[PDB]
A paper describes a structure:
The T6SS of [name] is a complex machine that the bacterium uses to intoxicate neighboring cells. Among the toxins this system delivers is type VI secretion exported 2 ([name]). In addition to acting on competing organisms, this toxin can act on [name]; thus, the organism synthesizes a protein, type VI secretion immunity 2 ([name]), which neutralizes the toxin. Our structure of [name] shows that the protein adopts a dimeric configuration; however, we find that its dimerization is not required for [name] interaction.
To gain additional mechanistic insights into [name] function, we solved its X-ray crystal structure to a resolution of 1.00 Å. Two monomers interacting through extensive contacts were modeled into the crystallographic asymmetric unit. In the observed [name] dimer, the long axes of the two monomers are arranged approximately perpendicular to each other and the molecules pack via their coiled-coils. This interaction involves a large (725 Å2, 13% total surface area) and predominately hydrophobic (68%) surface area, indicative of a physiologically relevant interface. In agreement with this, the molecular weight of purified [name] measured by gel filtration chromatography was found to closely approximate that of the dimer (calculated, 19.16 kDa; measured, 19.46 kDa), and we observed strong interaction between [name] monomers using the B2H assay. Superimposition of the [name] monomers showed that overall the two subunits adopt highly similar structures (Cα r.m.s.d, 1.1 Å). Interestingly, modeling of the electrostatic surface potential of [name] showed that residues in the vicinity of Glu38, including Asp23, Asp45 and Asp49, generate a prominent negatively charged surface feature. From these data, we conclude that Glu38 and Asp45 of [name] are major determinants of [name] interaction. Taken together with our screening data, we conclude that the regions of [name] important for [name] homotypic versus [name] heterotypic interactions are topologically distinct; [name] binding occurs at the face of [name] opposite the site of homodimerization.
Residue numbers in the entry:
A (entry chain A): 2 to 79
B (entry chain B): 2 to 85
The structure:
């Protein structure tokens, strides 16, 4: 079983890549952006599966932050 | 449970973010390098755990790719040549 710290890092990294790829779509060649757009739906499906696993972890383990905190866009970027 | 597809995305996103942090550490004047290194320890630990989970996810005759293919450095596969 994956450790809760692992779930946290995965959640954070999938959220960060999703943001980074989204940010550049506007400038990207439309052909490329369209293909990324489809990859990014796949990222969101993965993100949902990770959330479900994390919610199970929140019922098992203490000392974990709320899900919405993990995926929050960092203040220094917004 | 995590689906195989979810594990692949997680593995590849952790690897991508790891590469981004490594590039920052290699550039001039990394700020808070010790702290970037702390983040990388956690990244590495998650990566190892995800690796183990991915191996667990594979059937005996899986179609899914080797783990090493998921984490390989993209630039390492590129070749670049101008026209003569």
């Amino acid at each position: 079983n994956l450790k809760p710290q692992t779930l946290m890092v995965a959640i954070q990294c999938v959220a960060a890549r999703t943001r980074e790829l989204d940010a550049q779509l506007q400038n990207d060649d439309p052909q490329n952006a369209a293909e990324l757009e489809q990859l990014l739906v796949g990222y969101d499906l993965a993100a949902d599966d990770l959330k479900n696993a994390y919610e199970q972890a929140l019922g098992q383990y203490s000392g974990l932050p709320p899900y919405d905190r993990l995926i929050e866009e960092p203040a220094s970027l917004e």
